[PDB]
Every structure is written in C-alpha cells, then in structure tokens.
Amino acid sequence: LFNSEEDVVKMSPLPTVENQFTPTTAWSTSVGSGIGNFYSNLHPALADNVVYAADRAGLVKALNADDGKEIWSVSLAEKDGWFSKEPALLSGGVTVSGGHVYIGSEKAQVYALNTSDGTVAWQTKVAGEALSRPVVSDGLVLIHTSNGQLQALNEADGAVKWTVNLDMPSLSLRGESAPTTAFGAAVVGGDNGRVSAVLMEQGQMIWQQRISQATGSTEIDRLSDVDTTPVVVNGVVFALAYNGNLTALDLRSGQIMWKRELGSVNDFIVDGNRIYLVDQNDRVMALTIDGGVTLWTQSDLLHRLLTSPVLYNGNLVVGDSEGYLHWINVEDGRFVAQQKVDSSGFQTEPVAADGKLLIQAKDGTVYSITR
Amino acid sequence: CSSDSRYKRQVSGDEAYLEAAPLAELHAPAGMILPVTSGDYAIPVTNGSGAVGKALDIR
Amino acid sequence: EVPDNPPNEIYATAQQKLQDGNWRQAITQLEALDNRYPFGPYSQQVQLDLIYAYYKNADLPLAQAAIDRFIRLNPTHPNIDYVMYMRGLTNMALDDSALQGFFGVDRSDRDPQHARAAFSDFSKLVRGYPNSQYTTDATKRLVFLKDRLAKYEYSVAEYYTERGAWVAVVNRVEGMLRDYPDTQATRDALPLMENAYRQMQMNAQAEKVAKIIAANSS
Amino acid sequence: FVVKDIHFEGLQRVAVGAALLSMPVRTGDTVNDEDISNTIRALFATGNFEDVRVLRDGDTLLVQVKERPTIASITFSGNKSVKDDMLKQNLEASGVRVGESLDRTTIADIEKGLEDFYYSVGKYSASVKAVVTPLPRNRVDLKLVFQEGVSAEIQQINIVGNHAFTTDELISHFQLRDEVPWWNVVGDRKYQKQKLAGDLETLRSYYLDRGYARFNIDSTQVSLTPDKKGIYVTVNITEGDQYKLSGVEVSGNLAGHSAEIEQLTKIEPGELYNGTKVTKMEDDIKKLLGRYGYAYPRVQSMPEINDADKTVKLRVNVDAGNRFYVRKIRFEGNDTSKDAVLRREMRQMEGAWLGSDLVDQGKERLNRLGFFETVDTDTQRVPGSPDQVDVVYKVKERNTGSFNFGIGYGTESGVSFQAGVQQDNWLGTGYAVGINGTKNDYQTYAELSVTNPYFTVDGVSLGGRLFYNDFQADDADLSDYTNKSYGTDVTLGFPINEYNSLRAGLGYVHNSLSNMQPQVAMWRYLYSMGEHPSTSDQDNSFKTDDFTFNYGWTYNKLDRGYFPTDGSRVNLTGKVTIPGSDNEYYKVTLDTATYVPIDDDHKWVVLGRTRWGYGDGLGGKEMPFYENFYAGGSSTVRGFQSNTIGPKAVYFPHQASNYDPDYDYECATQDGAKDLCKSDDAVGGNAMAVASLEFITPTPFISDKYANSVRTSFFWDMGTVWDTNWDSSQYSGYPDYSDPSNIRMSAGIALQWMSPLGPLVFSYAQPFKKYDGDKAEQFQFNI
Amino acid sequence: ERVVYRPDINQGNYLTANDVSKIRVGMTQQQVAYALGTPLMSDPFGTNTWFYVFRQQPGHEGVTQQTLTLTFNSSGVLTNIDNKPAL
User: Fold this and answer.
1) How does it assemble (chain D)?
2) Cβ distance D246 to D306 under 8 Å?
3) Do D350 and C165 count as a contact with CB atoms less than 8 A apart?
4) How many angstroms away from the CA of C95 is the closest CA of chain D?
C-alpha cells in the first residue's frame, strides 16, 4: 500500500566532484546545532576577525577566527515569560557593529549585545520579527519585518525611527527584502515583486515599481533561493524581484534599463558586468549588467540545495545544504574543487572574507574554509 | 424471472391508477357552503380517445 | 460495450434490444448512439425510446434527467404528450413501487410528493395535450390521484382524531374540504370534524357540519 | 461581391446554420474583405473551430475550416490519492467535459488551475499534464498526467501578541499538528487553510472567555518558505487586557418572561468576562422563547466594554416575536412507511405555540426510531401571519428486517435446517417482528415475536411471544433426553417516562422430558426438587409446566435507535415464579447500553458493555439449569464456541443409557466409559458476569458515504459464569464454580458491514486468558 | 384507570387576559391581526369567527380547556367575543 501510495517528482543529482585545487577547511569551531532544517533568515557575522556566530538553539559565541577559539559567549536562550525556557529563535541574521550584536529574533524582540562580551547593550521588542537581515547603518536599524514595514530603529538604543509598510502580500510570501542603504535611499525589494526605493533617512518613497506578479493568478516559485534584497549601481538598481525576475532599473525613478523576467533566479552577486548567479533549477548561469546577456552557465550543479555563490581564493565558491562546497571556475563554469565539509548543510551563506570562508552549517555550524 | 413451479412469473406492470371509479360530489346545504377546491385539482376534465394503460402508446 | 457503429446500426439494435426486451443494452445502445450522434436526426426520438428503455427497465433517475433533457434539448415537441405523461408516469413509479399490495396493504398514504408531481404533470398533460390519447388515461390517473392524496390526508386527519388533536383535525380536513368536492375520504372526514367540534364545544358549527353530513350523505 | 454559396467544411458539432449565422457574412449577403476576416474570428468564436480560412471564387465563399469539437474521453494518470473527478470538477469549472469543444489554447490554463487546485489543496509541489490525444473524426482524449512532488505540511507557527499564555498551549487547542514520532502515530501533520481559520476562532474564543475584550488578531501570515514544505506562520494579535463582566443590561421585547430572562442572565458582576457563556446565555432565552412560542427570538447583545476599569457591561436587546408560530407540521419521506407512525413520534401539536423542546424530542423520537437515515425537517414559517409555521419533516428511512442463518448437517441429509427472520417495523406499520424456529432431526422449534408498539395511543407496546421446542437429543428419539418444551409470554409497553419505561409479563412454559442423563448438577436440581432418580440409568422423566411473572424496566438515553453516538440505556429485565408453578424460583438480569465518544466529533466511541444475571430458587427450591447462564462464542465474548463459558457438567456412570450406539455419544454411557466423569460441555452457572469492551474506530480505506454504515471495534472480551451453589464435596476431582473468579477471555476486533439488509456481523477473537477450558472457534461469522 | 401515569397533552392557539382586552367588539380582524395575530381557525362556510381555542390534558388529573370564539361580521368588524373555559 504505502510502498505503492508514494508520489514525489525528481530533483537531479550532483555530478562532477572536482578537486583540481585541493579544498580543505581552515578549521571547525562550530557553535552547535544551528538553525537546522527549521527555517529562518539567520546568518552569522565575522567582523574584526571575530566570528560572531551562534545557534538558533540559544548558544551565542564570539570566536577568535584563528581556530575560532572563543572570545566571548552568552546565551540569549532565556528562561521565563509567557513562554518559559526560551531558545534563541532568531529571525534576523547576526549583525554586528559598534558594541551591538544586532539580531532579529522570531520573538519580535530584537537585541544588540555588547560585542565585547555579548551582554545586551540594548534590546527592543519590535512590531514583528525581521523577515530580512538587520541592516544597520547611519543611526538606523533598517528592518523588513514580518509586517512588511520599513522599521527604522536607532542602533544606539533601540528607538524606532519609523515603521512604514512597503509590500504586503496575501500571506508571508517569503521574500528577503533587506532594505539596502544605497546612496541615501532606502532601497528595498518586494515580497510581492513590487520593488521600491524609499528615503533612507526618513522613509519617503522615491518610487515603487512592480516587477514580479505574485503567486495566485500569476503563479511563481517556492523552492528558489530568491534574493529579493536589492543591489544598486549608483543610478541603476540591479536586482531580482520576489520570484527572481532580474531587473536593471533606475535608482531614482525605478525605470527599467533591462530586465530578466525570464530569470526566476535564486542567488546572485553583481560581479562587475558578470552577474554570477544561481539559476532556478539549482544550476548556474551568469548574465551581463549590459542587458541580461548570458556570459555562461553550468548545470553540473543541478537540483541541489545551494547557498549563495562567493568569491574566495579567486574562485567562484558555492556551498549547499547537502553539506558539499563547490568551486566554480569563476568565469568558465568548471568545478575546480569540492569540499564536502559536512552533510548537515548550510542555511546561512558563505562569507568569502577575512581571507577565509565563514559558514554556519545546520548542525555542525562553523567551518572556516580554505583550499 | 424464469421459474419451474411458476409463481415468480408475475413481474412488474400495472394500471392501478386506471382501475377505480370517480367519486361522489358535494351537495352541502345553503349557508354551509365553503369553497371545494383550492388545490391543483382544477384540471381540464377531458379525455383524448381511449388507449389507456398498456393500451397507451409508447413512442 | 456499444462500439462505434453506424447510427441506424446502433438504433436498429437498440430497436432490437427494445423488441428483445433488453432495455439494459437498449439504454446502453441509445446513449452511445446519442453520444456519437447527439446530432442524430432521431436524437429526440432516441430520448423517447430511452425513457421507454428507462421505464421498462425501471430507471427513473435516468428518466428524470432525460425528460428534463428532452425539454433542455427542445422544450417544444409533438412528443410531450408522451413526455408529460411519461413524467407523471415517472412520478407514478416514483410515487410507489413497493410490494405490499398482495399482503392486503395499500400504498395511498406513503408519498404525496410524486403523487402531486404526477398530478402536476398529468394535469399539465391534459392541459398541454387534451387531444392526445393519454388524456383518457391521465385524467383517470388524476381521478385516482386526488383521492389517493385524500386517503393519505384522511390517514393524517385520522391520526389527529386518534390523537385527539381536534385543532389539528380541522385544518387538515379544511384543506381537504377546499381540496376535494368528491372524495369519500373527505365525505368520511365530514363526520369527524363535527365530532372534533363537539370535542371543542363547537357543536353549533358541528350542527352546521351535521347539515352537510346530512347534505353529503345526500 | 454577394456570396452564392458558403461551403461548410468540417463543422461536425455545430449546424450549417449554426456556422452560417455566426458568420458575419451569411449566404446571399454582400461580402466584404473585413467580413472575410470577420468570418475568421467569429467562427473561431465558437471555440469548436480549429481552423477558419475564408476564401471565395469571385464571390462564392469557401470557408476552409478545421474543427475542435467534442472531447470524447478524459483520462487521468497519477492522481492516486486525490479524486480525479475533483480534478474533473476544475474542468467543469472551466466548462470542459467529454462531449465538449476541444480548445488546445486552454490546455496549460486549466493545467495551471489543477496545479492551482494543488496550490490550494495543501500542496504546491504538484504538476499536472493534460495530454490531448485525438480521437476519431474530430474528437480528442484528455489524457491527464499528474506530477505530484509533495504537499505542504505544518512545521511551526510563530505567535506574537500573546503575552500571558503560551504559544505552545494555543497550538494544543488547535488542528495544527506538526509532530508524529517514530514511536507514536496518533494521526497526521498535514496542512489546510481552513484549519487555521477556525483556529483563529479557537484562539478568538480562548481569549474571549477569559475576559480579554480588547483582544484582537492583528494579522496572520503563513511563511511561503522556499522549500515547498515549510509551513511557518506568524500570527499577530493584540492581547486584550481582560475585562470583567460587570453587569447585564437586557432590553427589548422581553415578552413578559423577563424574570426568566433574569434567571437566564443570572451572572456575576466583576466576573472575568466570558462571551461564550453569553453566547450560550442568549440562546437559552432563544430556547426559552423557542418553547415560549417565539420562533424568531431576536437577541442582540452589546458588551459595553468599560476600559476605565477593565470591565464590560452587557446590553442585551430582545425581540421575541409571535406567541403561536406553530400552525401545523409536514412529514415527508414517508414513501415506504406510515406517517402516523412518525406523527405519533412527535411531541409538538399543531395549532400551537412554538415548543422547541417538543420538536427535537419528536426528532429524538425519530432518533430512537432506528429505522431511518436522516432525521431532518424544515420549519417553514408560512408567508402570512407569524402564527403560521409549517414544519416539513422530509426524513430518510432505512432498511428494516433481518434474516439470520446458521445451518449445518449437510445439504444431502434428512430434515435439518436452521432459520430465523426479523421484520421489526413490519411494512411501515412499525410492527416489531422477529421470527425463528427450526425443523430438525434433533428438534422441532417454533418461535414468534410480534409487537404492536401502540395498541393504546400512549405507546402500549403489546408484544406477544411464544415457543415450542420439541427437542429429543437424537440418540434414537430418546436415550440422551427427550424434551418437548413449549409455552408463551406476552408483555406490553409501560411508560415510566418518555425515556423511562417498565416491562411486566406472564410466562407460560411447559416442558416435558424423559430419559434424562445421570449427571450431578442436573440431578442436584432434581434433588432440590425432591426428585431422586436412578443415577446410572436414563430411565427418568420429568413434566413441568411452570408459571412465572416476568418484568423489566428500560432507561432509554442513547441517541439513535440504530446507530447512536452517546448516552446510556439501562434495560432491566427479570422474572419471578408464581403460585401454581411446578417450581418456585426466579431470575434477574441486566445488560447495559453505554456509548462513550472518545472525541466529541463522536467518531471514536467507546461502547461500555457489561452484563449481569442472577437466577435462584425462591427458598426451598431452585431455578432450573436450562436457564443457567451460558457464554462464549459471540455471546458476550467472541472467538470461543457458543455457550462454552460457564460451569462444566460432571456425569454419573451410566450402565443404562436406554441405548448406546456401540461407544458413541460417550457421557459414561451403558457401553464404555461408565464412570464419574466430567464433561467439557459448559453446564452454566446460576450467576453471571460477562463484559465486552468496544471502541468505535473509523478507517481511511472506506468511503464515508458508507463508512458511517460500518462499525469497526476492537475488544478484549472477558467474563465469568459460575455456580454459586457449586460444592467441593461433589466436585473434588472436578473444578469449582462457587467462586465468582471463573474468568475467561478472548480478544479481537468486531465489524459490521451494513448490507442492503443491514449489518451482517463478522468477528474474530483469540483467547489469551482462559479459565478452565472451553470450546473455541476463533473466527465467527454472524448476522 | 387506576394509573396515575397518563402523558400530558396540550393544544395551543389561545390568548391572554391582556389579549382579550386588546380588542373590542366593533374592531377589525386586522385589529385582531395587529394585536393578537390571527388564530388558527375561523368559520369557513360562515362569517368571520376567530377561534383562539386551547385544549389540554394534564396527565390523569382532569382535562383543561380554554375556548375563545371571536365572531366578526362579514366586513371583519367585530361582533362577538366569547370566552369559554373547560366544560
């Protein structure tokens, strides 16, 4: 019966494990079982060569990124309230600047731990948990919350500067519209596909532009790793809308230079004019900024469970939620290395910085990677 | 259906609504008159020649 | 079962299974006839043979839709004299079909619904086709049917008497009094409302009934 | 150009004139080159037109048409869980069926809508593929392939705005399960949006009954987690800061029943507010006015929520209506039965006030009918005065009557057949008939049981019973024991209440016996009769015509009369012998009828069934042994053989048996084995305690069109029958039943398939506790 | 008989002492229909004669009854109000 009752459509495997430049790890210093297969928008911080990594279970660490030995450790897994014995339950990723570890919690109570010790330098219960990264710049904690609000919060104490709804879909249409402080404008994508520039300093709409027509009578994806966070090249926002409809459009008016609505792209980095991206079939492509004219592709990665593509060791490095890492020949597509550093896999992203590659794996959290 | 002692061979088919007779009208006295038909019984009381029951055609 | 044949090749075999008495295949032929040829020239006459094949196979839920279908095909026809009879006839078989008759038990107290639904159609028939041969039959069905409802409603008016519910007696009869001028069920409810009145101390109205009792025993 | 002839090529569903008039240039009309193009799309506007190409020879139009008429079949492949007619309903939603115009433009559009159906059903990870397979002469098959990846399942809900209760305890109220272990399965975890909607109200109740009167759900957003599985939800609420019911301010048409209203608004001022109580309390008045004649008792309350003190004040606005809404009642679906049966099963009189309590009791009178499928009515307020309500009981009946059949002895042998038939509710009269009996070469049994439930209009339930068991215990015609047993007993219905009723009757019973077996407890009865025969010969006869007063009483609270859900029906029955009887004794017994719904869906119902029975002499005498209690073999315990649980008989040595068939029917007979032996036949006890533990369970493998006809229930059926007058002195190499502790058991699962003649019950059970042994048939097939 | 158990029986369709005060002889059936509604019986072959008549069996303790007959004229202008109890 149940051996015959089954029905699951297929996802293509991983071919091409390459090791042409022998990949390694720099170390492991893992916090613990991180977010796991639970879904949230958590992502660590590595500033001042300090791994500000934690788990959504509750253990918080500061790791001196040399073997990732601990600088400090606290635990925002709390103990009592209208729920007792809290975990971390973090909605926003780990943002660190100043003496403030800015983290959005799924409690809708957000914190700023004093980065020297992790004592809460301030914290704030806010209107809904952050659906995006705590974007902290210019006195303002730029929040895309659950409610689609442009919650601007003071990074010095937790004073709400304002809170303004941009894009409110039918449900939590899960888009990571992290409001990017770009050239004095609050630049934020859409959980509908309606993209916008708003004023950074007060939350005054520069414009709002529809790009993607959301699921429900215009049906779009719920597997794709869509970066609905925008990227601007000063006059032109080069970004994906809620399904991944790529669009070059003006910063100050929203007027389309070109757009790849053909894209339902998962991840992307705008590398010069070679936008290195993750296509919707969990395969690779790369288009121009001068049009979305394709530079190249790869489908060796195909239907895998990928993180963002990063540039480490001069190479297009990408990891996946199966626990592999992979090294795309940065222009010509080819696998150059494969480090299956775990099998727990990653919901956070590689950070190809500080001469390292910071990840928080789902269960074996922190591997620092080199080749 | 079929049988061998045959008291099963009586199967469906009847003219039961044909078999009776009509009935005997009202003769109520003066002042005690009330209306006699309000229902759908106000029918056009007529025939169209014979051919009743099984004698009625089936097209 | 009934494959792609010429329509007459279906229809004559349907006429065969009609004349074989196999309404089961005659239904099965005539459907796939009008499935392959709803544009059949006798697709109306398919339905008249279908209701023929339905009723002789006792297939009222098929004969319900087909009579509506013949209307929904074309509600104007010379064949409504069949159909408006057949719909009342469908309602006649829908009225009662049980086997309690040889038990010394009658069915004239069971269903007023497809009684009246036949009384709807058969009155519509003798309205719509007073000329057709059915009108001798259908009127006698209507002649039978009103007293069948009367005997039914007498059996209702019996119960409130056997209950003693004399207010519930009267209006049940007062229906029949303004329903039936002839039925003996009304003639025999005629003494009981007098009693119900005299149980309700409406003796004065009951002697006014007792006049009618005298007048309709006359 | 005026067309002389239009050429109608490949129409095949539409007529020529259905093609012709839809052409904006008809035959004989002035033809324009726009009307050429107008002939293209307007013929295409049929949707049955696969091509339209409109040409002419000078003016004589030739309209080159290919055609897309009737879909001739629709084939499904891969829908295995879900019904593909629900999928076909989306084709019917898009106006598509077999015998309907092909339109290959609409392939992906409805295919979207099936995946949009999938999007809505609790999946999104599910593709479909309509495959157009062309069939003869215009036609097409809609082969439909379904590529279903996964449904969406409940994962974790964020709750915000709750600040007193737990998120987690709120989920415990809900439909929303996201855990089934590897060592626990209580159900499933899957998603549906309508579960959430009531779970808003489950939450909305959950604060309102506390006092929370500024409680409000701000928003509620389900994560479209990019995995096609992740159902995460934020639900945003405002807590509410609980308020006191500080007073009730009832107003309006109080209809003179205002004190009763004050009893119905007997409240606490300062009570931490509970609007669900008010939700009850208003309708109690509507039930009060529903029995006070008012059928539209409009009650519109108003909670003056006083935020100055965290209290509410309760304005209530009452509009009763007319006092005598009940005109009359209509009764439909009587198309097999008699309505006066049903009309005597009512408690509302016509020409009355509305008594709402009279209605549903009469409906409960039809619930305790047990020969129905729907109990349902339409309280049609007739247009005119509001003294006019005609309540229209269109109800659905059910199958009556049952045959049971347990024949043996081969089809090729002499006179032997088992019988038994029931026609409870005989022919719509309500007459409770059950008739059995047999013509055997072991007996000739006769039996009748007919009842007029209403021989007086109260419910004098005049039930007559008789029997005639001309049994012989066939060795020759005798030689084990002759026993002709016969008599009758008529008992009537005695209303103690409208849910309580007594029984009382007189039983004639003549039993006439000869050549009885030498064995202890049978003869111990005879010695209690002062009758001490020859204990080694069956040379003994016994003639009894006992006269007895029988009685009984029924508690009657269970919902249906054939398929209840809840309640308890205590049905006492017993007897006593009278002067003039040939033996002075009695018996008393009782078996329960208790339903326990596990959840108040009443889908799983525990059926608490225990059984009691005690029979005894009236001092100086004895209750005879044929009415000693017998059990096992689908009696109260399944999986055994019939009547095999109880005390077991001990035989005397027979040196005469009046016949022995050369060492056959060995019971220490006149040939062989002639010693004080004990039979494994259950002789039965003077006291009984058997029980059965039954638990209704639905099954997902059955359509609930007919799973609601089928009752499936596991059990662990135990019981003891034992003889309180058993001794150790007569039974010293023989086990004892003086103790009540004589408990066997056999356990399994019960099933009824309700056939067109009702339930035909099959039962398997297996003994795991057996007190001193019985006979066993582990699978049992009954009616 | 000697059986104190008899089930109760009621009828309905009656009025109150307030209700009999709500109309006077000379008033319309409509004035009854506004204040008291209609009853569930009139004189069908004769004049407007409205019947708010109650019947009741208590349960082997007597029989109860209230008859209220309201004869109007043919115009429906009230001509008679007759209250009648049991017996």
Assistant:
1) Part of the Bam complex, which is composed of the outer membrane protein BamA, and four lipoproteins BamB, BamC, BamD and BamE.
2) yes
3) yes
4) 7
Looking at the complex, does the CB of residue D322 fall below 8 Å from at least one CB of chain E? yes
DSSP string over D89-158: HHHHHTT--BTSB--GGGHHHHHHHHHHHHHHHTEEEEEEEEEEEE-GGG-EEEEEEEEEEEE-EEEEEE
- On chain C, the residues whose CB falls within 8 A of the CB of E41 are 167, 170-171
User: Chains meeting A at 3+ CB pairs closer than 8 A?
Assistant: D
Beta bridge partners of D567: D558, D595
CA A136 vs CA A146, A155, A157, D51: distances in Å: 17, 7, 12, 62
Q: Is D458–E9 a contact, with Cβ atoms under 8 angstroms apart?
A: no
Closest CA to A120 of A80, A88, A165: A88
User: Angle at the Cα of E8 (from E3 to E10), degrees rounded to 5?
Assistant: 150
**Residues D609 and D589 sit within 8 Å (Cβ to Cβ):** no
E85 touches chain D (CB under 8 A): no
- Interface residue A167 vs chain D (CB under 8 A): no
Give E41's contacts in chain D (Cβ within 8 Å). 351
Give the gap in angstroms from C-alpha D566 to the nearest C-alpha of chain A: 34
Q: How many CB pairs under 8 A join B and C?
A: 126
Choose among D747, D753, D760: nearest CA to D640.
D747
Question: What is the β-pairing status of strands D594-597 and D605-617?
Answer: antiparallel
What does CATH list as the number for D7-64?
A: 3.10.20.310
* D197 Cβ contact partners less than 8 Å away, ≥ 6 residues apart: none
CATH code, D71-151: 3.10.20.310
Identify the CATH number of the domain defined by range D516-781: 2.40.160.50
Domain locations in chain A? 1-371
Query: Residue D104 corresponds to which amino acid?
Result: R
In the numeric block, the tokens 């014979």 are attached to B50
Contact D385 E9 (CB under 8 A): no
- Domains of chain D, residue spans: 7-64, 71-151, 153-238, 244-319, 326-397, 516-781
Chains B+E touching (3+ CB pairs under 8 Å):
yes
Distance from CA of C147 to the nearest CA of B (A): 8
CATH code matching the domain that covers D244-319, chosen among 3.30.1360.40, 3.10.20.310, 1.10.10.410, 3.30.70.20: 3.10.20.310
Judging contacts by C-beta atoms under 8 Å, the chain C residues touching residue E69 are: 202
Among the listed residues D228, D254, D71, D232, the one whose alpha carbon sits nearest the alpha carbon of residue D149: D228
- Closest residue by Cα to residue A265 from A232, A311, A220: A220
Alpha carbons D749 and D758: distance in angstroms, whole number: 19
A7-to-A3, D148, D149, D189 alpha-carbon distances in Å: 10, 6, 6, 17
Distances in whole angstroms, Cα of residue A113 to Cα of each of A32, A155, D763: 20, 11, 68
Q: Which partners does chain E have (≥3 C-beta pairs < 8 Å)? A: B, C, D
Instruction: Using CA coordinates, name the residue in chain D closest to A41.
Output: D225
Biggest CA–CA distance in chain D, Å, is 126
Nearest one of D158, D467, D34 to A174, comparing CA atoms: D158
Contact across the interface for A222 and D224, Cβ inside 8 Å: yes
Contact present, E58 and E72 (Cβ < 8 Å): no
E25-85: CATH architecture: 2-Layer Sandwich (3.30)
- Is domain D326-397 given the CATH code 3.10.20.310 in the classification? yes
Q: Is D554 left (phi over 0), alpha (psi -120 to 50) or beta?
A: beta
Which residue in chain C has the smallest CA separation from D330?
C156
Residue that has been written with the tokens 């500033």 in this structure: A47
- Inspect the structure and tell me whether chains A and D have 3 or more CB pairs less than 8 Å apart: yes
Experimental technique, in short, is cryo-EM
Residue of chain B with shortest Cα separation from E43: B34
Q: ∠ CA(D216), CA(D218), CA(D224), 5° rounding? A: 140
Report whether D339 contacts D311 (CB < 8 A): no
